[PDB]
Amino acid sequence: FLELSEDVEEYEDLTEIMSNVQLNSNFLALARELDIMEPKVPDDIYKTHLSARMNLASSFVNGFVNAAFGQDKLLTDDGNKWLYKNKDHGMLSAAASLGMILLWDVDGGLTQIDKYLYSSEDYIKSGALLACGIVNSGVRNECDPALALLSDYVLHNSNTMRLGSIFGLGLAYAGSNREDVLTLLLPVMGDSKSSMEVAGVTALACGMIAVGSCNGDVTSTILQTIMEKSETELKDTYARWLPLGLGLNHLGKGEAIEAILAALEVVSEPFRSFANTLVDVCAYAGSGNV
Amino acid sequence: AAAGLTVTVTHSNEKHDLHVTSQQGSSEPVVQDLAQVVEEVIGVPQSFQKLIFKGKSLKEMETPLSALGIQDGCRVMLIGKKNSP
Numbered sequence: 001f002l003e004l005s006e007d008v009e010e011y012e013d014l015t016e017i018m019s020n021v022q023l024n025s026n027f028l029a030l031a032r033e034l035d036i037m038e039p040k041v042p043d044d045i046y047k048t049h050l051s052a053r054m055n056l057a058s059s060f061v062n063g064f065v066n067a068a069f070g071q072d073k074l075l076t077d078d079g080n081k082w083l084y085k086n087k088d089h090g091m092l093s094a095a096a097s098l099g100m101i102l103l104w105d106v107d108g109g110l111t112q113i114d115k116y117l118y119s120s121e122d123y124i125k126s127g128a129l130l131a132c133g134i135v136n137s138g139v140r141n142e143c144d145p146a147l148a149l150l151s152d153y154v155l156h157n158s159n160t161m162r163l164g165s166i167f168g169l170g171l172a173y174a175g176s177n178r179e180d181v182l183t184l185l186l187p188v189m190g191d192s193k194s195s196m197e198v199a200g201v202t203a204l205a206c207g208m209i210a211v212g213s214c215n216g217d218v219t220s221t222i223l224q225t226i227m228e229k230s231e232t233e234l235k236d237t238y239a240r241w242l243p244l245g246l247g248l249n250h251l252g253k254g255e256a257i258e259a260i261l262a263a264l265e266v267v268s269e270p271f272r273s274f275a276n277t278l279v280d281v282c283a284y285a286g287s288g289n290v
Numbered sequence: 291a292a293a294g295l296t297v298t299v300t301h302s303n304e305k306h307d308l309h310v311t312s313q314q315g316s317s318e319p320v321v322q323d324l325a326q327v328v329e330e331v332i333g334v335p336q337s338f339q340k341l342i343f344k345g346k347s348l349k350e351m352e353t354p355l356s357a358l359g360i361q362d363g364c365r366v367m368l369i370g371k372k373n374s375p
Contacts, residue, residue: 107303114340114369142365147345149369180345 001140001176019140024104027068039072040065052087056094059086063097070105072098076112083124092127092164095119099131109135110145126164129153133168146172147181155188159198162188166198170205177213185209186221196233199225200241207245214256215249222246223263235271243275247282257283293318297360299328301368306331318356321348333373340369 001018008014016022031037042058045065059075059082066072075082075098083091095116102109113135116128129150136146146169153165166188173181188194189202203222210218222242226234250257261276292311295318299306310327312319325336341348343355343366360366 107300110367110369111302111371115371118338141367143342143367144345145342145367145369148342148347148367149340151347151349 015142019142020104020138021106021141023139024068024070024106027104028070031069037069037071039069039074041074052090056086056090059090059094060097063100066101068101068104070102070108070112072101075101079116083121089123091121091123092130092160095124095127096130096134096164098127099134102131103134103137104139106136106139106141106145110149122158122160126153126158126160128164129161130164130168133165133171136168137171137174140176144172147184154184155191157193159195162194163198163201166202166205170201170208173205173209175209175211177210177215181209182206182215182218186218189221189225192228196229196236197238199229200238203241203245207241207248211248212251212253213249214253218249219246219260226264226267231268231271235268239271240274240278243278244282246275246279250279250283252283252286254284254287254289293356295319295356295360296362296364297324298363298365299368300365301332301370302372316354318354319360320354320356321351324355325351328368332368332370333375334368334370335373338370340367342367342369 004011004015028037039062042062042065045061046058062072062074075094079094079098083094086094095113098116099109099113102112110132113128113131116124116131119125119128132149133146136144150165150169153161154169156162156165166185169181169185185202185206189199189206191199194202203225206218206222222245226239226242229239246260250260257280260279264272264276264279267275293316294309294311296307296309299308308327310319310324313323313326314320316323321341324341325339328334328339328341329336336351343358343360343364346358348355
């Protein structure tokens with residue numbers, strides 16, 4: 001999104017078409033013109049002519065097929081029954097898959113996810129919040145409903161609820177480079193109560209929001225969080241998101257990465273040798289630097 | 291002495307360019323006045339209705355949105371289900 005003034009002619013249309021507001025309307029219109037609108041069941045994709053996780057995979061592929069459409073009664077009419085029938089950790093992903101169906105459908109998606117927002121289970125609530133971020137992801141909006149919708153959940157004490165909102169804001173503000181969003185999510189990055197994977201997801205959200213921006217305060221917070229976190233518990237299985245945020249923030253820039261790796265040189269070898277390589281390759285991506 | 295102001299409400303693929311004014315003795319339109327207009331137009335109760343402006347959450351009922359930064363040409367998002375008691 002290019003942030004400019006209204007002094008230019010036909011500014012309302014320019015920001016709208018830049019915001020991809022009519023992206024969804026045109027995409028559905030062309031899909032109807034091709035007659036490609038019928039919700040393709042995951043069952044006949046599987047060709048079942050001849051289980052909780054398998055049912056989850058069926059729900060995810062159904063959302064993938066019906067993505068950006070918003071027309072799927074499988075998770076709309078009897079969606080509550082499906083998530084209730086679902087087991088353990090999959091209700092968050094099923095609701096997020098519903099948001100995948102409704103992505104780029106701001107008006108339609110928000111109304112059809114508002115009912116699921118007040119759900120009882122924490123996973124369903126977190127999935128609904130993640131569904132809202134998926135809906136507002138990519139497409140830009142004048143009032144930006146994602147920021148106001150994710151108000152208590154941005155720093156909510158519950159790990160799952162905070163994870164869904166943070167991932168939703170990251171997908172929403174991806175490429176927006178908004179100062180307000182950065183100044184609200186980076187303090188969440190500084191939280192110590194959040195788990196190691198929660199901190200990684202915050203770094204992922206910050207990285208995708210500030211991708212290719214060389215955001216200095218984001219990098220300083222990333223390095224400071226790494227330093228504060230103990231190395232032994234850092235290098236286990238989930239600190240691999242912090243270098244990813246660094247690589248995204250310096251994407252396509254190069255040269256200056258020497259400063260980041262020099263500051264990162266204090267880290268122990270098992271994670272430093274991984275982090276410095278990841279940020280280097282992401283920054284030098286699309287360059288032919290053999 | 292009507293303090294008219296133009297707001298663009300959007301919800302459920304439906305958009306209206308309402309010219310609302312303060313009615314409950316306030317010098318400027320407020321959340322109570324906007325909620326009353328929304329309830330008259332649709333009927334969503336103030337408990338579960340969600341008005342979104344510039345990414346700012348509406349939680350305080352007495353916060354004046356005219357002071358918060360609503361001007362002509364501003365758009366707001368309405369979230370909820372149309373209830374017909």
